[PDB]
Design a protein around this ligand. Sequence first.
Ligand SMILES: O=c1[nH]c2sccc2c2cc(OCc3cccc(Br)c3)ccc12
Lengths: 195, 197
Amino acid sequence: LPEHWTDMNHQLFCMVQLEPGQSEYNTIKDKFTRTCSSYAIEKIERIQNAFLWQSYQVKKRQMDIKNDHKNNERLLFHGTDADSVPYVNQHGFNRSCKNAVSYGKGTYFAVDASYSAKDTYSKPDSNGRKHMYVVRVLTGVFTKGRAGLVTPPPKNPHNPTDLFDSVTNNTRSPKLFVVFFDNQAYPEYLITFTA
Amino acid sequence: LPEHWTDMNHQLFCMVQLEPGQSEYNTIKDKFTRTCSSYAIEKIERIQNAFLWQSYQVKKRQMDIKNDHKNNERLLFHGTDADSVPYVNQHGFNRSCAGKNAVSYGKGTYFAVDASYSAKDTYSKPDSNGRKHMYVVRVLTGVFTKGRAGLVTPPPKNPHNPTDLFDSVTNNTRSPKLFVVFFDNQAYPEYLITFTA
Ligand SMILES: O=c1[nH]c2sccc2c2cc(OCc3cccc(Br)c3)ccc12
């Protein structure tokens, strides 16, 4: 388990509220304020989920072998409703769980926090609180998505089981990625914020 | 990787044809013929898929820790069409590709206790040469309950703690004949039986 995690008294799941003004909080807040500087941050939590981390790291090691390079991970954003937050913290992102799915039936992740900050995604709750994850995503080798995909396309129609790792809206200048498998995304931080 | 697998000389995938009279072949044939005595096996292949095995074994270890001393794994059957076999061999069972079952206990991947169920033409569709295809699958059934057609994940054990889930669902908890799983890497395709009438 990562060095920057804090001790969990022999437990496997903890949400740790970050200390404002320390390097870790500052780094995550800056990623958010790059595009969401008009919002108000209530708190940032580090998600320490040993099981989800384990499964994700196995997939990363496999994708690093398959792709023969270690440039397969991106840090992306995911806005969701308050009622989904406990599920994501414990189980991560589930493609089987309203919004447009124009690039395929997977879990969507934004390059810019401002996109995930839309009320359609980070739905404000009874109190006006909005919720956005900072997510480690194994985007790997990607291609343009399209409606109705249930997996990424093959890299070559001649070898139909050798797949792209993810899809995007635009390969030259991506603003969203879609992944189609359990444990290709690790929810690393939860930002609680208002407009 | 299991020590009795063939050496794949650094390759990550291969299908190994088994020999009749070996215990490994005979136990699978016996498990199949217990309910499919009218069909005849062409061949049995051991599926050696390093990446699927790694991710499955991680999930098994997690479930064994979480459930504390449950037998979490069952050996079940899955009939499918020839067009799906390359994908399953490489990538396993994808709930997003699964058909609606004639009796639906949820939107997931279905596995049968009896080979006879998987042997129905509706699952193990005969190909253009009359070959039918059935996997023998290690499935992490864990702690289960009776499913419902509307499920896209197993239900919670307790409605006041919605994130603490059953591992799988079944048609009948007293006499299970099918199980449904809703997550990737909860089922390892271990053998492929090719068979005919
Ligand atoms: O942060 C997100 N959270 C959630 S919760 C349900 C969908 C999304 C989403 C979709 C996203 O893209 C959907 C989409 C799909 C097609 C065109 C355009 Br533009 C945008 C991007 C980010 C998120």
